[PDB]
Symmetry: D2
Subunit: 401 residues, 4 copies
């Protein structure tokens, strides 16, 4: 059954036609986000019983890579939607799922994030939740890197409790409308790459969050991650989403370069080459990177299958979660090194005119990859894999590991 | 999910690790270990159960090769090459030949040797000639180099070029013959940097008669299969993926052995402000970089191995199927080659000076083994082949190396 | 005597203030080119006897790198000026130089190129009085805007004495028939005005010609002193790449000191104490130190041979090998450093497009493609393995 | 004069003839050490007035690299002799120089080390110096990695004071005869590479050190290093010696590979080239490594000239010493990466037969380089250069930085 993947492939084809012009402007790719809404793919992981497609994580990951190969910003938005959905599904109550999931199908929800990317200790988080009557909370503060925060049907929001008789310093998460009073999407995203992901800041001014919007009790995510209960799959799932962004960009860059080489590169006739496509060093560049891409992609498919396997389990052991996170981290490390090298070095196969003509726009691939690969430092993913291999220590679960 | 065969290979590898350091110094023929492999039954992994074999798959074979190679690269090589030789026989032998040979191979515990599918020369430049005799036999003459596993071999897979042949000179003939056939001399002239117990020296054929029931196909049939990209040309991707698993196995064995050394000799650098080398950020980074690359390379290799099995089971294979497989194998080999050559050298940086000051530690065996065999055929042309496919949509030209 | 270098350092300091906004616009950095004119440094290699500074190639190369570290386009324009000057000096007669060089000092000449860079089809048709008419369109004409003179190359055509012979001339950029097309819109090197120039019936007078037709080809085939132009110019490129590398490293370090946060899971209090941040700076700073030190030695050898009356193909070939080696190392270094330093700075260095650090990669990524480093590598390999010096050309 | 370098070149040629058989056996290369004695080059830095050659550090460094290119163990021994000589010369009194230097010419001293390479805090040093009457000290203990300790005419020895009314924990350095009673060279060097450097352990049993053998007063080296006086040049001098071992090994390996390639120019059967010396990928391997070698050697010559410049100064500032040490560390880092990569990857240019015949012996270059590059961890030389560049901190003078 390749129906969903065919739909994603067709979306990506349409995105390729316009990405060069669209991403220069930045801003919100509303038309393309609506095209994704109409495709139904946002419901890939919602059961057929609840109106979704009843598909699997391997399909999601392949769709993410395909879309990202055409437009990295749309790939990012699409993949982040599923990271946000994964968080919801891992913490939501039975009655929340019975209400939200049919509604997400009917209303074609595209989920945004504000924000699960807090590069700081919990007591230093920008956004605080203070109690209101009847179990509600009030959210205040400004957070940056709110991925996909424009045109979002719901925002997955995070805050730390304050002035709370039931405990200060606890992480609360909630899924709220983006037009709730006091939510201000600031529109300040102007980035090197990932230019159409609307990953700017969001300011919360006295924003009300109701109990039926809270995703577990305050502090539950800390307990679930540290214990290795099922929600501890969120981070390997999400880090593998990022991995598929990088592999998608890598494949799109390699295929765009090859098209240029076949139609535009002149041979270095000084060295007796009649066609650039027959040049031994041009061929070596393509071979080195296509070979690494093939292996990285084949490996990523295996880890995606393991995500699905553990996703279906009722309980996951620390060894099972830790081995998965190590495999994901390994795939991310290899994909990061590959995409960053490839998107820069492929110019050496294409020649000077590929850079002399700014309009060719090939630098988009490097810009997009160079931007998002910094989400969290690959040096610490490397350290995490090393600490496991040498010392048998699995990574400490967190929002980044 | 039958893990019995892989358990047997794991136990074999365990025993080999105990003695490999002393054995590989001596070189020569690891007869005791070859006999342990014979007793294990694993040489029959790919023979059908109907013919007395284990009826297992290429994924199992490849995993077993990597496991054994991680303990002893020469024994992994010998074991892997046995299946390369077996694959050639299976792809070219008649059903009648197989009906006789495979039960015999099970009963007599055959360990196959090679003499030799590694020529590195145009057919006209081959040293070993096959002169036709009136009954359809061929007389073989010449000295063949790089005859891997040629010592203690129950049968040799032999290649020669026709000479003085009214039906055409320069055609490749292949046969499977006893190693004690009159005129066969295994020369034992192997004294190498690494892969020191693979007996990859020369074999001299002096008037060796190979009989018609030992010939594999007709003269030149392997060249025709290569030109067609047909199923018998699967021999090369199968064999190149065997090599890939030797390199992944050596890499895994090296990384684990290094980790063991680091944990038990964890003296930190004075100025480094570390209490333990196992907490040093730069030691951890070396292990992490190489372990990550190893995980991805291994996971990728498993996928290519499943595809080998799929096409192995087909009655017919198209050049497009064969070419895509060869590109995928070449890609895996390229990554595995770069990985094992970098890792076996750079892990010293994580272990520290005493790992090299003590020759007896013997860790350089991993680099020596990998550095030797990765030269079998130049990785630069595997890279060119993948690039020519990706850029120009040209599949590699089938050959004994591509 | 560091007076010239001090002038270059102060110019570079001024250029840093404005480069971020200027290079976005592209186009011609007229004000900064005029600052270079006022500095006198365009006359670095002209003898004091002819009104110049009487300085050495080592000083020129250090000034190029310094300016390039601040503004790669201005570094390129400045460096190319000296490539153009080197060509004039190697081929012009003493009588021509006695006129041109004091004029270049008085009129503050900034030389442009059209063009030093396979098969050339801009033609030079001989006229009876020794003049030529130039026709055709050149590409990649670096510094062709606001140029006091253009160094122009063409091949003879309709020539009873032999078609296809290369002629070179130094002509005013506003001579009738010269059209600078203004079509440069590039990834990096955005203010180098390296677009196309169209020649329509452009007259070249005999006293503007540099040597005789085909003389440059003869000099390449002989490996004689004028063939030094290529190693001189390839080492100019090398110093652009080393300068960009140093500028990028320093800009990154400033960001790391003033803006980088420690990764929350690092267990370190300051990003400047993070072991992996320190390893990135150390690995690239170390390579830069060795590359810069080696480049200084090769620059001294350029000067030594520049002063010789005659140069052998063995002297020229050995120098070219050393220049190629430096260029290879500098190319790899600058391309890796300008991309990887983001990993020492963090996500916010890319999240804020206005920071503009990608300029370094864009500039280096653009100009390092001038000629393929793969063939510089092959040339060094062919020398080391087969004892064959590079075949002299406009690229080797 | 190029006399000394001609002498070194001729020595190196002789060593190449026998290095394969000698390094396999290990042990002491006595005949070759005596050849170095006959050459006079051990006296390169002794003034002509004291009987030496009156030469300079740039000459010494070139000679080290030339000899190392032929035989890394002899290059190491020769280089370490000059590290030992530098230490002596930086601390010896006028009386000691007047006595020792003519004696070193006449007796042809080849200096050994036992040992300036203590990977441990001063208080934790293996070897102690306890006061004796009349200003003598008694040395007791075992130190490992005593480079060139066999057939050494004098040993440079280091110990820490104890039971010393004038201060415990102070570093004493002395130059003593190797046949002084109580000195036991243990002969336990059996290494991967550098196999003929006799870098095993030395045991001191009640060894007497007289006042006229002491190199300064106890603790003077620590004062000199901390102050940046002239003896603080010892570490950059010595680390640049190691750098020249690595560049020498690199050049020797590259030249040996090229000779093999030229005399075994068998092209790969399917390469489509007539000869391996015309293969594009063979040429790329030689070009990449030859290019890096040219730049590293040129940079090393510049740093050697700076060593000589500061060597002649009466005073060196902490900035001058720190800048030199940064330049030396940078050279050592680059040379380490280059030699380790080159000595392994050049097999790819030569082909399978270069490894199939162990007797070819090319692996000696990798084994020698792989062994000595671990002397002190390159990761911390990298950190030191990074700490300088990013934080403007020069390395703290020590025996390793
Ligand atoms: C680094 C770069 C871009 C990004 N968009 C959302 C997160 C994030 C992190
Ligand atoms: C080619 C290259 C290296 C080798 N080691 C054992 C066999 C063999 C063949
Ligand atoms: C001028 C400026 C940039 C360039 N890139 C390649 C050539 C070239 C010339
Ligand atoms: C002398 C010889 C070889 C060595 N390896 C590490 C240190 C050291 C010292």
């Amino acid at each position: 059954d390749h129906r969903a993947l065919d739909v994603a492939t067709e979306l990506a084809k349409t995105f390729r036609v316009t990405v060069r012009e669209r991403e220069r402007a930045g801003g919100t790719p509303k038309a393309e986000r609506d095209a994704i809404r109409r495709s139904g793919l946002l419901t890939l992981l919602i059961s057929k019983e609840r109106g979704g497609l009843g598909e699997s994580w391997p399909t999601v990951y392949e769709a993410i890579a395909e879309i990202a190969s055409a437009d990295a910003s749309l790939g990012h938005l699409f993949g982040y939607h599923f990271s946000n959905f994964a968080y919801v599904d891992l913490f939501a109550s039975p009655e929340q799922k019975a209400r939200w999931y049919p509604q997400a199908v009917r209303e074609r929800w595209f989920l945004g994030n504000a924000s699960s990317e807090n590069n700081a200790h919990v007591l230093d988080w920008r956004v605080t939740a203070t109690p209101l009557p009847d179990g509600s909370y009030e959210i205040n503060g400004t957070k940056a890197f709110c991925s996909g925060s424009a045109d979002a049907d719901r925002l997955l929001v995070f805050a730390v409790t304050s002035r709370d008789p039931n405990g200060d310093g606890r992480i609360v998460a909630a899924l709220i409308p983006s037009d709730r009073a006091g939510v201000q999407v600031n529109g300040d995203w102007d980035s090197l790459g990932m230019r159409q992901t609307d990953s700017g800041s969001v300011t919360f001014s006295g924003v009300v969050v109701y109990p039926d919007e809270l995703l577990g009790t305050p502090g539950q995510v800390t307990d679930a991650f540290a214990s290795g209960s099922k929600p501890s799959l969120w981070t390997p799932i999400t880090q593998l989403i990022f991995t598929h962004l990088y592999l998608g960009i890598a494949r799109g860059a390699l295929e765009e370069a090859a098209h240029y080489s076949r139609s535009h590169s002149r041979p270095f006739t000084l060295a007796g080459v009649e066609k650039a496509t027959e040049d031994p060093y041009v061929l070596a560049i393509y071979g080195e990177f296509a070979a690494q891409l093939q292996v990285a992609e084949a490996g990523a498919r295996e880890v995606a299958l393991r995500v699905q396997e553990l996703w279906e389990r009722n309980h996951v052991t620390p060894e099972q979660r830790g081995q998965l996170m190590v495999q994901v981290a390994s795939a991310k490390i290899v994909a990061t090194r590959l995409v960053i090298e490839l998107t820069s070095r492929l110019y050496e196969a294409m020649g000077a005119r590929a850079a002399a003509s700014r309009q060719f726009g090939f630098d988009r691939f490097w810009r997009d990859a160079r931007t998002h690969t910094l989400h969290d430092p690959v040096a610490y993913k490397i350290r995490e894999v090393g600490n496991w291999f040498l010392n048998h220590r699995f990574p400490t679960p967190s929002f980044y590991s």
